[PDB]
UniProtKB/Swiss-Prot annotation, chains A, C:
Enzyme Commission code(s) on record: 2.3.1.-
UniProt PTM: Pupylated at Lys-188 by the prokaryotic ubiquitin-like protein Pup, which probably leads to its degradation by the proteasome.
GO-annotated molecular function: acetyl-CoA C-acetyltransferase activity
Ribosomal protein among keywords: no
Cystine pairings recorded for this chain: none
Encoding gene per record: fadA
Keywords noted in UniProt: Acyltransferase, Isopeptide bond, Transferase, Ubl conjugation
Protein name: Putative acyltransferase Rv0859
A Pfam family recorded for this sequence: Thiolase_C
Gene3D superfamilies per UniProt: 3.40.47.10
Catalytic center residues: 91, 358, 388
Length: 402, 724, 402
């Protein structure tokens, strides 16, 4: 019924894993800092109208446990009626928070909702929360659990993406994220993180390597850190994809998403709710869709989810101006581009997680807020945001500029 | 609850309380020669454990001992094999009662010592693991382990739970539980499975009571308390919640799936699940979780397949089931091996290993010497790995005598010919040594395809000519196929039978027919793979199908070992008899195509795989264009079933024709000779134990066969003897 | 827009904490057991129309980490396009999953959604997930963290509920729960937990003490378990409620909810989606709401959440036939009953968590399923389900029988 609009979409810079600037910053502080910025932009807002705060978080333990969304509401001095719920749909948790918020606004039972995500991967490494699919042998043996880095290599093998191919995309992502920063694109949306004394802690995306060359990317070694180098998983993958003889391991640390810290926030409301608060709508949520594909390859989820959200909105690829897919691995983006036949100049036009990093819980809300800015800057109409998800899920969203 | 089953049987346990208060439970089942975890034992231990509680005030220690030559070995397999899915309640309550007895014995408040005198296998080791101290006698023939996984089961008497508490999740699974390893007393103490050793079985009970007297004096508070029952117990390697173990825990099912190659063997999966799920809870909840997984295995079909094959069938064979009755034993003094190829050299090694004096003859002394070098390289491998001493390795090689003169076969009373596959060559090779060997010398032949009756006409003592078929590598293949020609006496059969057991291998007695049983059946397995390759199926999918079916080696790799030039000879040979008009297998076209291209197998240097330097290195890339691979993409289960059914159906033909005389020979012969998957219980058991979407049983086998026959050819039609 | 209907609402029995029957059951297995029951009840349903599985879980760690909702979908052989997301809104997580499921159906972007919760408190204890509100002194100091039991005692002190008043309600809960079991009220909705072999593990709510007496309850001592025996929290509450001199500790283990294991599943979908699968709608979701009150008292949350869901549905207290409030503490139910003047014949008519237990992640879905069954049994029309939430939140849902 009611149409759901986006009124604000900000994010923190992404601090790197090794000697990161955000390592001393609790993930609760990352979110409170973004709430304080929303207040600065609208000090006249009636915060009593905000009825929920929905935050994605893939590792809700320790500094990120205990419903961190509600902690943000209380720690920021927001009204006690503002709710606060945490959710975890792996890498899409940020965009699922936004989608769920949009769906709650459409139902008419919520008026003005805050959505986003937070993931301090240097303080709470991925896997800190455990899990049945990984740590219980009965179900691990059944679902054929395989680390995502191996599904990405398998995708490159089946599709025939070479090491030079995935390295070529990695270079593009670096150059486009660099051009976006130096062009002032992110100037209004990236909220610098400061300490309790006002001192600057971080104001840019540390993980970026702007002076990357194709010769340097080729010197890198294929992934050999964590579960990927444990053993057995390549054979497990080939038992299902039995027509493949050997996996070509092409993904390194230079063509995969980086491990970083960050947080993002999006303010979503109905037209009546924004008009009552003096807010100007920036974009409209047109349709959402969740779907999935095989959980052993794990990273083919974007295609059926993007296909599903295009039918619900009555649209085709020709109708979409910008395609934003999370750059978890280069082959996932190249597989997606090959399936739907996406033009190069429409795909991740401002660089992606390979350049700027992938803070699991927040990434969906970050690339969503990235598309809101680029549509307004280019004066374009539509954008489609999607992410590959662990376990073979997919989530996609179509936003329209207002 | 109760230490008993219900709410009749004989008494198994002997009670003895001494003046110091030590009770000596001596197990002595009067219905057999071995203590077995049967219904009589459960009742006898129930009464014994009730008494330990009732007389607790006058008891200071317990010593569990045995009166047989072995300590305690195995469970009641005659009953576990009849457990239907509806019987799951009874199977659960039985193992729960067995473990409630051991738990009471273990938390008695006083030290319990196991006096292990012989083999403590299966449930027997589960008894000793429930004691606080284990003393073993370092004697010959003594083994300790938990080999339930080899029967498709798991240690349901606390073996999974206690070994995990003792060694951790990873060490217990890999070294004890997953493969059911058996340990000698010296090795058992080293890994921590036994606490101390003694020289003779007479010292066990005295040493046991001495340890109790000392433990009560030196450790008054910790006496009769297991490490996992103390406060502040730390599991070795951590619990599943420990960050160190959590990091590698996701790779345990993937490593296990890599070792099993995707085969549908449910028991190792269940052992790993029971192991980990148990470490997350207390000891009693862990023991109950293990019970439920045990009941899951017993009421399933694979366990019935493996219980049938690796317990009943294997026992019937070792007990001389195929050995003729009334024939006595005959010693072997000097073995004479003709031909120093990989077969003859392997035959010379396994015979010298058993203690026999071997004369290894070839056509040149250079050739015979290279044949003994096979035994030298093998002994240098075992000497480097510490599995033998320098003295026994020197005595082994000294028993092998290479030669090139026919006169050096003097004193040989057991000839094993292993020369080239050709009739008139074998006729000439036997004709020049048959007069030098002893007058009662066995004249064995290691042919794979040629009928034994034909080869027998080349000797004058045809009653002693017999087929002795080995499988390469002889040092690691456990089967010997003994072919009975229509002139071979029952004495020649029993002599080769006894020779087979003496060298540590399992025999099957097979009537003379072209292809015998192993060559004929493994042919149909390989021919199915080549047919699929001709049909356009991807070569990697064929190999995955062979491994996921449960074969030790995938079929295309196996063809390279067998070499296609041999396979093409078999096709011309079995056709020259049909002459009628021959009905060729679809695989015959693929063999001739590869021979035309000069890719005959590993011996040539090129086959379905590429061979760079010495080792195999990936499938031949030109294979996909030759046979247009990828054009036919059947379901993986159809590929798997085509290979299993072809052999299963061919085995039934051998049983009908009289090639085999028992399904035990069929099951063990297929498992140990040609590598049929163990979870099937053998290529004969596969029929009665087939389980798929169409159901379970022989009727389900016939339906699946007819479904396969409709889609892939009439060679899958079931024989009349499998029908109603 | 689209009306959301409840089609099936089932739950496991609740197993007790100490020497519980469900202690040996993995929380993933409790959910898969309920999914297998739905297959048994509707064998011909096309599971490809199920677009998301939403599970509440308050301590998503260990056996409950790694998105246990997605693990449920994969382990139970459901279609790989059926999603799976875990959320956490403390004690209201179970009902929040239903509400979000209902709101996803209303938006038209979802088709058929499974909602519910899971919590094996005997394996994953409360607090296992950490949390910034309690384990960060900077946050803990500012927002005045007080455990829930002391808020319940402070509620009893202010409103004037005596030790006998709260013990009188505790006996009322035990009695009405036993009467519900004796009458066969729970025969169709409580699905007994079985093992891999089909053997029975638990078939009843083994935390119930039906032979409770008033004298027995008076012998218990005030709450002395963790987070309460530690000093400070009494003075921290009185520093905010400075007009109260002394807190009257009246809550014991006999008038508080019980630590139990359990899970629940609710099937929600549009009218068209159920008609296509041949499902019969059992109740309609009418409206949901989220509000809150003071976080130091922590448990006065259901009062504004109930008023808000009533004003959004155009209803009053007289129009509601059955009220269902979670029995975390007796004083919370008495306070709620006092504020809105609820007749006793309408309040927790089949007993509550004081008798049957409180599996944090699942309770919301469990008491919702209780109300769908009781509406059909009484042939009544409307039921209101609300829960008090930690941190001062409130959630409420109004359902109408169809």
């Amino acid at each position: 019924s009611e149409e759901a609009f986006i009124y604000e979409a900000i994010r923190t810079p992404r601090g790197k894993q090794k000697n990161g600037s955000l390592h001393e910053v609790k993930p609760l502080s990352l979110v409170v800092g973004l709430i304080d910025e929303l207040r600065k932009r609208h000090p006249d807002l009636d915060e009593n109208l905000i009825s929920d705060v929905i935050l994605g978080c893939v590792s809700p333990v320790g500094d990120q446990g205990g419903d961190i969304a509600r902690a943000a509401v209380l720690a920021s001095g927001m009204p006690v009626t503002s709710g606060g719920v945490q959710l975890n749909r792996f890498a899409a948790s940020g965009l699922e928070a936004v989608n769920t918020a949009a769906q709650k606004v459409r139902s008419g039972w919520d008026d003005l909702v805050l959505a986003g995500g937070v993931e301090s991967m240097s303080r709470v490494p991925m896997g800190s929360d455990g899990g049945a699919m990984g740590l219980d042998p009965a179900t691990n043996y059944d679902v054929m659990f395989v680390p995502q880095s191996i599904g990405a290599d398998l995708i490159a093998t089946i599709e025939g993406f070479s090491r030079e191919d995935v390295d070529a995309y990695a270079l593009r992502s670096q150059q486009k994220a660099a051009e976006a920063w130096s062009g002032g694109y992110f100037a209004k949306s990236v909220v610098p993180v400061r300490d309790q004394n006002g001192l600057l802690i971080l104001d840019h995306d540390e993980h970026m390597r702007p002076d990357t060359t194709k010769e340097g990317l080729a010197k890198l070694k294929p992934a050999f850190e964590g579960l990927a180098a444990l053993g057995g998983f390549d054979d497990v993958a080939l038992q299902k994809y039995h027509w493949v003889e050997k996996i070509n391991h092409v993904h390194t640390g230079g063509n995969s998403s980086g491990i970083v810290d960050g947080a993002a926030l999006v303010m979503i409301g109905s037209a009546a709710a924004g008009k009552l608060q003096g807010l100007t709508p920036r974009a409209r949520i047109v349709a959402t869709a969740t779907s999935g594909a095989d959980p052993v390859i794990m990273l083919t989820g974007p295609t059926p989810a993007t296909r599903k959200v295009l039918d619900r909105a009555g649209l085709t690829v020709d109708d979409i101006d910008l395609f934003e897919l999370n750059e978890a691995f280069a082959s996932v983006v190249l597989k997606f581009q090959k399936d739907l036949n996406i033009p190069d100049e429409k795909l991740n036009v401002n660089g992606g997680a390979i350049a700027m990093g992938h803070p699991l819980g927040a990434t969906g809300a970050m690339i969503l807020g990235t598309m809101v800015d680029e549509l307004e800057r280019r004066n374009a109409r539509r954008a489609l945001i999607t992410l590959c998800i662990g376990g073979g899920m997919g989530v996609a969203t179509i936003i329209e500029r207002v | 609850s109760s230490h008993h089953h219900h709410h009749m049987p004989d008494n198994t346990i002997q009670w003895d309380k001494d003046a110091d208060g030590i009770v000596t439970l001596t197990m002595d089942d009067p219905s057999g020669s071995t203590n077995v975890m049967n219904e009589a034992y459960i009742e006898s231990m129930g009464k014994a454990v009730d008494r330990l509680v009732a007389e607790k005030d006058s008891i200071t220690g317990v010593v569990v001992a045995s009166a047989k030559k072995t300590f305690f070995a195995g469970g009641d397999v005659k009953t576990m094999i009849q457990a239907r899915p509806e019987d799951a309640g009874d199977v659960f309550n039985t193992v729960e009662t067995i473990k409630r007895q051991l738990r009471t014995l273990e938390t008695l408040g006083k030290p319990v010592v196991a006096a292990i005198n012989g083999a403590a296998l299966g449930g027997g080791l589960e008894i000793a693991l429930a004691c606080h101290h284990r003393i073993a006698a370092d004697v010959k023939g003594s083994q300790l382990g938990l080999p339930a996984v080899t029967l498709g089961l798991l240690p349901g008497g606390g073996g999974v739970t206690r070994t995990v508490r003792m060694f951790g999740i990873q060490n217990a699974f890999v070294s004890v539980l997953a493969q059911g390893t058996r340990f000698k007393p010296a090795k058992a103490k080293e890994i921590g499975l036994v606490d101390e050793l003694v020289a003779t079985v007479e010292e066990l009970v005295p040493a046991a009571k001495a340890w109790i007297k000392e433990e009560l004096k030196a450790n008054p508070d910790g006496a009769g308390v297991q490490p996992w029952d103390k406060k502040g117990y730390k599991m070795p390697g951590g619990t599943p919640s420990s960050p160190g173990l959590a990091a590698i825990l996701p790779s345990f099912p993937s490593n296990l799936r890599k070792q099993l190659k995707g085969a549908p063997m449910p028991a190792p999966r269940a052992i790993l699940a029971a192991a980990v799920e148990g470490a997350q809870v207390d000891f009693d909840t862990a023991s109950r979780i293990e019970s439920r997984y045990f009941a899951s295995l017993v009421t399933g079909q694979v366990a019935k397949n493996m219980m049938q094959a690796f317990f009943f069938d294997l026992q019937a064979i070792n007990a001389g089931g195929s050995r003729p009755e009334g024939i006595g034993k005959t010693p072997i003094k000097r073995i004479g091996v003709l031909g120093a190829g990989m077969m003859g050299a392997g035959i010379a090694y396994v015979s010298a290993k058993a203690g026999y004096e071997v004369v290894l003859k070839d056509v040149s002394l250079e050739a015979a010497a290279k044949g003994k070098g096979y035994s030298e390289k093998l002994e240098a491998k075992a000497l480097e790995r510490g599995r033998t001493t320098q003295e026994r390795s020197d005595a082994l090689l000294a028993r092998i005598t290479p030669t090139a003169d026919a006169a050096d076969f003097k004193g040989v009373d057991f000839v094993i010919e292993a020369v080239f596959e050709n009739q008139e060559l074998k006729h000439k090779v036997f004709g020049e040594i048959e007069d030098i060997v002893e007058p009662n010398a066995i004249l064995g032949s290691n042919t794979s395809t040629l009928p034994i009756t034909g080869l027998a006409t080349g000797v004058k003592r045809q009653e002693d000519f017999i087929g002795i078929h080995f499988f390469s590598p002889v040092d690691k293949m456990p089967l010997v196929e003994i072919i009975k020609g229509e002139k071979t006496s029952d004495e020649a059969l029993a002599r080769v039978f006894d020779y087979t057991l003496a060298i540590g291998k399992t025999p099957i007695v097979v009537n003379d027919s072209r292809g015998f049983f192993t060559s004929r059946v493994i042919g149909t397995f390989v021919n199915e793979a080549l047919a699929m390759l001709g049909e356009g199926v991807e070569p990697a999918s064929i190999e995955q199908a062979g491994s996921q079916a449960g074969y030790p080696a995938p079929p295309l790799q196996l063809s390279d070992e067998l070499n296609l030039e041999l396979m093409h000879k078999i096709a011309v040979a079995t056709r020259k008899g049909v002459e009628g008009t021959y009905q060729p297998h679809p695989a015959e076209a693929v063999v001739e195509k590869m021979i035309e291209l000069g890719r005959s197998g590993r011996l040539k240097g090129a086959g379905f795989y590429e061979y760079a330097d010495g080792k195999r290195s990936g499938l031949w890339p030109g294979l996909r264009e030759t046979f247009k691979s990828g054009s036919s993409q059947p379901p993986l289960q159809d590929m798997i079933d085509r290979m299993l059914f072809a052999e299963a159906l061919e085995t039934q033909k051998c049983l009908d024709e009289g090639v085999l005389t028992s399904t035990a020979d069929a099951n063990i012969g297929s498992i140990m000779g040609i590598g049929f998957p163990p979870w099937t219980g053998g290529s004969a058991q596969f029929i009665v134990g087939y389980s798929g979407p169409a159901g379970t049983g022989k009727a389900a086998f016939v339906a699946r066969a007819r479904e396969l026959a409709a889609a892939y050819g009439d060679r899958f039609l079931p024989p009349e003897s499998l029908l109603s």
